[PDB]
Amino acid sequence: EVQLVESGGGVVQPGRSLRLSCAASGFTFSSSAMHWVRQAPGKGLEWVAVISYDGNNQLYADSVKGRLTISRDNSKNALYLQLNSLRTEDTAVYFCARDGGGYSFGTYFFDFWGQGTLVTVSSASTKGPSVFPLAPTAALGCLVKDYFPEPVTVSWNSGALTSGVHTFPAVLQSSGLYSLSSVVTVPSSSLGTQTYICNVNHKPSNTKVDKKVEP
């Protein structure tokens, strides 16, 4: 089995540096040209860079040239990507990919990929969320707002309410803080008898908040 394992993604302030790595097994690494390809959240794939079998020749997309440096150490079966003078727009899942054979001809396709490592380029500092109730089949929920970075987790009644729950994927705001919504559909009958608490967890800010939702 050809395998490529990436490492080293995280958050980074604009202008600062970061270095991704990729470990290869199951082929002769030193006999393949290697690429990085990226994909901003919810957007399509963009090829970034290629390096020769030797490590001695690199080419770059216009979008990244002068701020990324692809490199390799064949003795460690390791591919690297060095991000410098970083921009908010450089935010994305970065994949290492084996060239399909056509390096020499300028004909790049990618026959093996890795998991991708997320690089998030933001100036905003770690922050726990404010949780507001979305009060009322009817429908109840929580608004988890102004937190950084990803992710939060959201349970209801500490794991007891599961059915009918929809935790929506986050959104980035003007502010550069994320805002999320979790809701549950519930029989209207039960809105007096039964309590609805959302458990909101933000490990990056070392936060757990329980919030009661009622009419």
Binding site: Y53, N56, L59
Partner: protein, 78 residues
């Protein structure tokens, strides 16, 4: 350095035969004798050819039999 007589005999003549392989770029381990595909810089300022796209001069230095006033003189090429 002044040049005098040519030694005669049958021990006065030597022949050198060889191949010089071309050095075109060898952009991968199957493309000996070829260069990397040409990429054109958008401007003069940004012109930055990688090694595997730059053919280079071939050169070979061949040792001849030792002579110690006597030097080997090259006379004919094929």
């Amino acid at each position: 350095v002044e040049v005098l007589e040519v030694k005669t005999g049958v021990d006065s003549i030597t022949e050198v035969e060889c191949f010089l392989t071309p050095e075109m770029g060898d952009p991968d381990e199957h493309l000996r004798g070829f260069s990397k595909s040409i990429s054109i810089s958008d401007t003069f300022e940004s012109d930055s050819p990688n090694r595997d796209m730059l053919p280079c001069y071939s050169v070979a230095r061949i040792p001849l039999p030792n002579l110690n006033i006597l030097m080997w003189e090259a006379v004919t090429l094929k």
